[PDB]
Design a protein around this ligand. Structure first.
Ligand SMILES: CC(C)CCC[C@@H](C)CCC[C@@H](C)CCC[C@@H](C)CCOC[C@@H](CO)OCC[C@H](C)CCC[C@H](C)CCC[C@H](C)CCCC(C)C
Ligand SMILES: CC(C)CCC[C@@H](C)CCC[C@@H](C)CCC[C@@H](C)CCOC[C@@H](CO)OCC[C@H](C)CCC[C@H](C)CCC[C@H](C)CCCC(C)C
Ligand SMILES: CC(C)CCC[C@@H](C)CCC[C@@H](C)CCC[C@@H](C)CCOC[C@@H](CO)OCC[C@H](C)CCC[C@H](C)CCC[C@H](C)CCCC(C)C
Ligand SMILES: CC(C)CCC[C@@H](C)CCC[C@@H](C)CCC[C@@H](C)CCOC[C@@H](CO)OCC[C@H](C)CCC[C@H](C)CCC[C@H](C)CCCC(C)C
Ligand SMILES: CC(C)CCC[C@@H](C)CCC[C@@H](C)CCC[C@@H](C)CCOC[C@@H](CO)OCC[C@H](C)CCC[C@H](C)CCC[C@H](C)CCCC(C)C
Ligand SMILES: CC(C)CCC[C@@H](C)CCC[C@@H](C)CCC[C@@H](C)CCOC[C@@H](CO)OCC[C@H](C)CCC[C@H](C)CCC[C@H](C)CCCC(C)C
Ligand SMILES: CC(C)CCC[C@@H](C)CCC[C@@H](C)CCC[C@@H](C)CCOC[C@@H](CO)OCC[C@H](C)CCC[C@H](C)CCC[C@H](C)CCCC(C)C
Ligand SMILES: CC(C)CCC[C@@H](C)CCC[C@@H](C)CCC[C@@H](C)CCOC[C@@H](CO)OCC[C@H](C)CCC[C@H](C)CCC[C@H](C)CCCC(C)C
Ligand SMILES: CC(C)CCC[C@@H](C)CCC[C@@H](C)CCC[C@@H](C)CCOC[C@@H](CO)OCC[C@H](C)CCC[C@H](C)CCC[C@H](C)CCCC(C)C
Ligand SMILES: CC(C)CCC[C@@H](C)CCC[C@@H](C)CCC[C@@H](C)CCOC[C@@H](CO)OCC[C@H](C)CCC[C@H](C)CCC[C@H](C)CCCC(C)C
Ligand SMILES: CC(C)CCC[C@@H](C)CCC[C@@H](C)CCC[C@@H](C)CCOC[C@@H](CO)OCC[C@H](C)CCC[C@H](C)CCC[C@H](C)CCCC(C)C
Ligand SMILES: CC(C)CCC[C@@H](C)CCC[C@@H](C)CCC[C@@H](C)CCOC[C@@H](CO)OCC[C@H](C)CCC[C@H](C)CCC[C@H](C)CCCC(C)C
Ligand SMILES: *C/C=C(C)/C=C/C=C(C)/C=C/C1=C(C)CCCC1(C)C
Ligand SMILES: *C/C=C(C)/C=C/C=C(C)/C=C/C1=C(C)CCCC1(C)C
Ligand SMILES: *C/C=C(C)/C=C/C=C(C)/C=C/C1=C(C)CCCC1(C)C
Lengths: 229, 229, 229
């Protein structure tokens, strides 16, 4: 309780843990192999986030980075979460649309670069250079969003209508929520320091729970995850 | 020689190195693609463990974690080993039975969570919280063992008898040996500190060599690794 | 500018960034799924290297390792680069020849061991043991080079001539350039310290740009990357 942001770390931990259990239970029984992929991916995403939220809450996932003449609290465990959970989320989208393997490789690799350069930016001790890493990471994010909108135009002649519908919704959810993360980082504790860490942590908790549990509710309620038969 | 546990690190290094060379030589010549997968996976497992045993023996893979009012010797390199070798072992099992891709994803991801939360527990400076990580990691292990016994019931109508037989043996080997690891950690140097590090290191060496070289001897002697023709 | 090797880090950053942009633009429009794999892999390789070159240039990717009675400058970010980019390069070769999945697993796993043991060697504080890690890593490299020459003899009865031709060239490029890396490390800052860091950094920059951008120019100009139709 001694860091003001504890309450949002504790609520994030609980909501990710509850979402994990819900999806775990929801997927019991599923035999359709395509459906099984989606449940597996979509359950792992909040399970991983539960662990990293808990590491932040307990303090393990916090470090102090000197920059700006200050010791700055930096929650590094978010990058360990996102390193795995953001390619998994892209994989759910790419599987919806039957993406080509090269497109998946492009997505997962640009996502790696996005999270890894965000982590270097987050731990960089020269203040001005933190924003060079931010810009590179943002360029990788823009590439991802570009591919999600313009990279699947060979696939629309052979998409089931329900897959197109669910993919469109989830792609919109993704673009809107993910685009907020660089803005929060830029104005928050890792960037300009205009928004205090407590509010930052709240913002990321709302985005994370929506981008993981909200996303997954939409996906796992859809008939698009089943091979049709 | 100055740490009492050196002798078990040196024997583990030698046995993993010898097992690697044996499997490397055994797999020379194999042309069956299915067989080649199994040799590749099963040889990489002790090769990786050889490297991490050597890093422990030379001291690189040891760190001191303060907790309990003490500087505690913690061999972190075991988590770097297991991060790769325990999904590889699961992959050998999953390939035996032709698992669905979603099942493989579930297994490898729960295994990631098991090893990563074990590593956080191993490096956590608040003593009581180390056991919260232990419990989460154990829950992931139980999930894995659940899937290994109850997750492949679509596959039994089209399993060759020899694949079913070898998978049953290896699955039993896996459940018994892997279930001992949380117990050793709980009573050893990373947990309650009731068993000294020297004996702990012996225990993990016996389990590791059996779970990697013993496992692999059983697998690579079986006709189940060949496509049948 | 305060480290003499800055100029080669800055030129490496620029050449990797330019090569990335060139390949990105070159691959726009490509619809052939096989071609898309090769563009994706081959573009990610210099993009990752651009980021790690920049981290070296800005100082983030440098650490001081005590060994030999000295504080030694060690650029660790090269291992973070190579961890991903050297399996990606092997994947391009393995895809050319339609390698079996077990062969790919062997290649990527031996490459992991090569880079991870090179990183342990690079960070080891006991000088003589640094060269034990070097020898293990070199053994893994030799295994890789062995597989590249002798591991694809089931594949030559069903290789398109242009794929055989491009694979031969790239395999030769690979063997020659990669074999120089252990020699540079052995005589440079991480090893015997006979070649100063500034010249070392130059050597690795020439090798990296050739092994990534030179390699990729050869590959992406070839008709071998297209499924034939
Ligand atoms: C079954 C397996 C998964 C293995 C079990 C692992 C794990 C679930 C164990 C629970 C972790 C949790 C108890 C950590 C303890 C936090 C904290 C209370 C420690 C001491 O703090 C006490 C006071 C001090 O004034 O602050 C805090 C005062 C209050 C006591 C704060 C309480 C709020 C919670 C800590 C926040 C909820 C986190 C939960 C783990 C959410 C899990 C969801 C669930 C339904 C799956
Ligand atoms: C239930 C069986 O698993 C379902 C399969 C098939 O649909 O999908 C796979 C379902 C999921 C992808 C499986 C995810 C792995 C584990 C079940 C996650 C639990 C491990 C840890 C206890 C961490 C999560 C704790 C929780 C409270 C967030
Ligand atoms: C298919 C499989 C069979 C293949 C597996 C092969 C493999 C098992 C072979 C043996 C592996 C073994 C050598 C692993 C050793 C661990 C290694 C990190 C040791 C180096 O030192 C570690 C710590 C010291 O406390 O410093 C840290 C060192 C440096 C300061 C950081 C080095 C950077 C990393 C090498 C790159 C990865 C960093 C991130 C974890 C990944 C990207 C994260 C992103 C968000 C930035
Ligand atoms: C600091 C920088 C990010 C620069 C800020 C401005 C910049 C983000 C806006 C320019 C993006 C640009 C692609 C917009 C042009 C749209 C166009 C190409 C698409 C064609 O028409 C499609 C229509 C609907 O049918 O609009 C639908 C729109 C299209 C599908 C294209 C939109 C894709 C974008 C990637 C989504 C914009 C959100 C950004 C990622 C915001 C990033 C936040 C940042 C400040 C960190
Ligand atoms: C070919 C490639 C793989 C590359 C080569 C890499 C690698 C195999 C090189 C060998 C590593 C090894 C020599 C490390 C040295 C350990 C140690 C002796 C260092 C100094 O210690 C001396 C005394 C001090 O009183 O203690 C110790 C006294 C004794 C001298 C202890 C000796 C016991 C061994 C160190 C334990 C065996 C480890 C082996 C590497 C096992 C390999 C198996 C093999 C058949 C593949
Ligand atoms: C022999 C050719 O390789 C066999 C293929 C096909 O079956 O499988 C692949 C066989 C294995 C999966 C290949 C594993 C990679 C390396 C051969 C491992 C050696 C690299 C290092 C020297 C570490 C191991 C040293 C040893 C003494 C433990
Ligand atoms: C398909 C491909 C092409 C995709 C590849 C994309 C990629 C190559 C893009 C560029 C990668 C690049 C940015 C890597 C940089 C390395 C990175 C670790 C730098 C951060 O700082 C590293 C050290 C400082 O000494 O601190 C450490 C930082 C923190 C203290 C720890 C951060 C946590 C990690 C980010 C999560 C991984 C940790 C483990 C190694 C993995 C799980 C282990 C488990 C057992 C806990
Ligand atoms: C601290 C906690 C671990 C709690 C300790 C007790 C707990 C591990 C025991 C309860 C597990 C429970 C699933 C047992 C019920 C069996 C049942 C569901 C299977 C149905 O019947 C199958 C028969 C043979 O045909 O028995 C064969 C048995 C079945 C195939 C099911 C057994 C699967 C288990 C995962 C194996 C038990 C070993 C544990 C992993 C021990 C963990 C050690 C721990 C203390 C860290
Ligand atoms: C669009 C997205 C990718 C996001 C943008 C991220 C990124 C491209 C931003 C550029 C990074 C760069 C400006 C870092 C600054 C380095 C340095 C000048 C910092 C201060 O140093 C000043 C003096 C001191 O005497 O030394 C140095 C004096 C000189 C000023 C040195 C100048 C040489 C360059 C720093 C080396 C070139 C590096 C480039 C990033 C190459 C990129 C290639 C491009 C065409 C894609
Ligand atoms: C262009 C669309 O992408 C092409 C696809 C299909 O061929 O391949 C995929 C093309 C590549 C594999 C995509 C690589 C991911 C990003 C486009 C790389 C840019 C992210 C960062 C800004 C880092 C690179 C900066 C640059 C200056 C080196
Ligand atoms: C398919 C997916 C869904 C699966 C994903 C599962 C996963 C998301 C589950 C949760 C992951 C989570 C626990 C990650 C936590 C990060 C972890 C590194 C925490 C440990 O401590 C990290 C730092 C402290 O600053 O110390 C560092 C600790 C030690 C000093 C080093 C430990 C070694 C590593 C565990 C092994 C990897 C090291 C390299 C980055 C990889 C190989 C590099 C090579 C070149 C040596
Ligand atoms: C310190 C150690 C590395 C030892 C140094 C010496 C050692 C590297 C040389 C012995 C390698 C050995 C396989 C050579 C025998 C060749 C033979 C098996 C191939 C059969 O005939 C093929 C012909 C052309 O048709 O030659 C073409 C040649 C073949 C295709 C085989 C060559 C494959 C090698 C892996 C390439 C040699 C380069 C090395 C990797 C150099 C390593 C540098 C080191 C000092 C760190
Ligand atoms: C589950 C959590 C999700 C979906 C997180 C998404 C995170 C991003 C899209 C992060 C983006 C970043 C930037 C583009 C710039 C640098 C800062 C980051 C890493 C926050
Ligand atoms: C090759 C080595 C093998 C098979 C290692 C297996 C390790 C485990 C099953 C580890 C399990 C753990 C727990 C369930 C709780 C926390 C402690 C661990 C990581 C030892
Ligand atoms: C893109 C960069 C490339 C192709 C780098 C290749 C690096 C190697 C082949 C590294 C090899 C090493 C050894 C065999 C011994 C130890 C030192 C290393 C890691 C430099």
């Amino acid at each position: 309780t001694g860091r003001p942001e504890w309450i949002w770390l504790a609520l994030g931990t609980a909501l990710m843990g509850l979402g994990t259990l819900y999806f775990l239970v929801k997927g019991m029984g599923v035999s359709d192999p395509d459906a099984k992929k989606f449940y597996a991916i979509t359950t792992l995403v909040p399970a991983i986030a539960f662990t990293m939220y808990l590491s932040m809450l307990l303090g393990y996932g916090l470090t102090m980075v000197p920059f700006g003449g200050e010791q700055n609290p930096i929650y590094w465990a978010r990058y360990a979460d996102w390193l795995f959970t953001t390619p998994l989320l892209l994989l759910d989208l790419a599987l919806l649309v039957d993406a080509d393997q090269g497109t998946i490789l492009a997505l997962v690799g640009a996502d790696g670069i996005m999270i890894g350069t965000g982590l270097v930016g987050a731990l960089t001790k020269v203040y001005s250079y933190r924003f060079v890493w931010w810009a590179i990471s943002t360029a990788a994010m823009l590439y991802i969003l570009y591919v999600l909108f313009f990279g699947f135009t060979s696939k629309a002649e052979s998409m089931r209508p329900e897959v197109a519908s669910t993919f469109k919704v989830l792609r919109n959810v993704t673009v809107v929520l993910w685009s907020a993360y660089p803005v929060v980082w830029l104005i928050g504790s890792e960037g300009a320091g205009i928004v205090p860490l407590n509010i930052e942590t709240l913002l990321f908790m709302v985005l994370d729970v929506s981008a993981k549990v909200g996303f997954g509710l939409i996906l796992l309620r859809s008939r698009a995850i089943f091979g049709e038969a």
